[PDB]
Amino acid sequence: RQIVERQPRMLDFRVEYRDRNVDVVLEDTCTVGEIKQILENELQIPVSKMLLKGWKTGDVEDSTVLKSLHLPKNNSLYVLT
């Protein structure tokens, strides 16, 4: 046998905010902050004003590279303002 744990190169995110869901697709070399910027374009709220939630720890930063979070292919997040 040989055993390989493949990390998906494209990450799918469904981000919930209030009544609404924002779909986001990006490479796992992107940062968490790039998700927030896409959220700002969709919600017209500044990234400064959003608490992006759903990660498994509370130390994730805007500069965190998504690959380092060992995320599943399909992800559920949500935004607090």
């Binding site: 040989q2 055993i3 390989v4 060992h70």
Partner: protein, 379 residues
């Protein structure tokens, strides 16, 4: 005659070692005859205790009995979840440059330990268990972590292995190891969708994987604060109420009495997975009053029915994220010590429409089993 490598399930509340030898996995019993060991470390006036010895004296020595180090490993002191968890631990956590350290009294002195040092002591015990069975020093190991652990948690778990004197061959995901134990990479049936339902002592993890040709995560869900401990506490509160009715006294603010009750409740809970009734006895529980009673499986199920039912919600959520119907899950895998509860098994089986579920490996051993296989493959 070369030394085998070991697989170690380094669990939040219990750990487990296996070794693959002679075409077969052996899950290794410790010197109590036990195949799981509490992930507990204690510090007394005279010695350092690890495993059962540590967990046995938690009620008498709560300030210097460490557990849950897995909730701290690779983490930052300022993490809200860390600060939230600290309110429930009787041991002190301090800040060293945003790195948490556990602080205790040891041989009369104040000592502080990094999470990976605490975990390295658990891993030392698991290493010594394997060595007592194999008859020689063990230097190589695969260690498992939750699939959602980040780089920092993985690196700190590996550091705990190095501090324990192990060459860490690889860190792999717990649900991967569970699937390996069931040969789910070797069905020869093409790509398969696998759901891992992992209910332990402190945490509940649901993972959906695809497996094709030995290549393994499509969705995750769960609750990092739902586990066997919460079922114990439903029993604790039940008997606290029974003790009020029988003796008109409230024991809930006596920390030693509650912990002694919790220990006895956890044992009764285990018995209720094999029998429909269990007895419970604690001498001098409170104000020297002896406590002795019994409980039925049915009564235990009623006390926990909402918690048991709540486990299906993360299953539905993971299926939604993976965009899969429950009928598209080819292999269902129940692991974790709490999946031994018959009501839990029945709720999952009914949810997956009467399907026979993968349960013949002991569910608190399947992760160590798969780690042992991965270890042999890497030697």
């Amino acid at each position: 005659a070369k030394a085998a490598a070991i697989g170690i399930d380094l669990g939040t509340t219990y750990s487990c070692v296996g070794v693959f030898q002679h075409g077969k996995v052996e899950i290794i019993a410790n010197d109590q005859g036990n195949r799981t060991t509490p992930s507990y470390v204690a510090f007394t006036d005279t010695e350092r205790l690890i495993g059962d010895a540590a967990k046995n004296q938690v009620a008498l020595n709560p300030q210097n009995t460490v557990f849950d180090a897995k909730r701290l490993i690779g983490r930052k002191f300022g993490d809200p979840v860390v600060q939230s968890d600290m309110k429930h631990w009787p041991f002190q956590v301090i800040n060293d440059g945003d790195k948490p350290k556990v602080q205790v009294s040891y041989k009369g002195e104040t000592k502080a330990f990094y999470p990976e040092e605490i975990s390295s002591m658990v891993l030392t015990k698991m290493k010594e268990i394997a060595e007592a069975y194999l008859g020689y020093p063990v230097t190589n190991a695969v260690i498992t972590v939750p699939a959602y652990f980040n780089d920092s948690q993985r690196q700190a778990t590996k550091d705990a292995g190095v501090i324990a004197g192990l060459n860490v061959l690889r860190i792999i995901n717990e649900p991967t190891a569970a699937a390996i134990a069931y040969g789910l990479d070797r069905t020869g049936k093409g790509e398969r969708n696998v759901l891992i339902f992992d209910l332990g002592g402190g945490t509940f993890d649901v993972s959906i994987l695809t497996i094709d040709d030995g290549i393994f995560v499509k969705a995750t869900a769960g609750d990092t604060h739902l586990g066997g401990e919460d079922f114990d506490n439903r029993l604790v509160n039940h008997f606290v109420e029974e003790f009020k009715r029988k003796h008109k006294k409230d024991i809930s603010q006596n920390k030693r009495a509650v912990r002694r009750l919790r220990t006895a409740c956890e044992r009764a809970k285990r018995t209720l997975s094999s029998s429909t009734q269990a007895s419970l006895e604690i001498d001098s529980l409170f104000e020297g009053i002896d406590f002795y009673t019994s409980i039925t499986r049915a009564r235990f199920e009623e006390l926990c029915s909402d918690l048991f039912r709540s486990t299906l919600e993360p299953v539905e959520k993971a299926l939604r994220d993976a965009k899969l119907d429950k009928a598209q899950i080819h292999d269902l895998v129940l692991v974790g010590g709490s999946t031994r509860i018959p009501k839990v098994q029945k709720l999952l089986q009914d949810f997956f429409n009467g399907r026979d579920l993968n349960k013949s490996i002991n569910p608190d051993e399947a992760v160590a089993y798969g780690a042992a296989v991965q270890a042999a493959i890497l030697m």
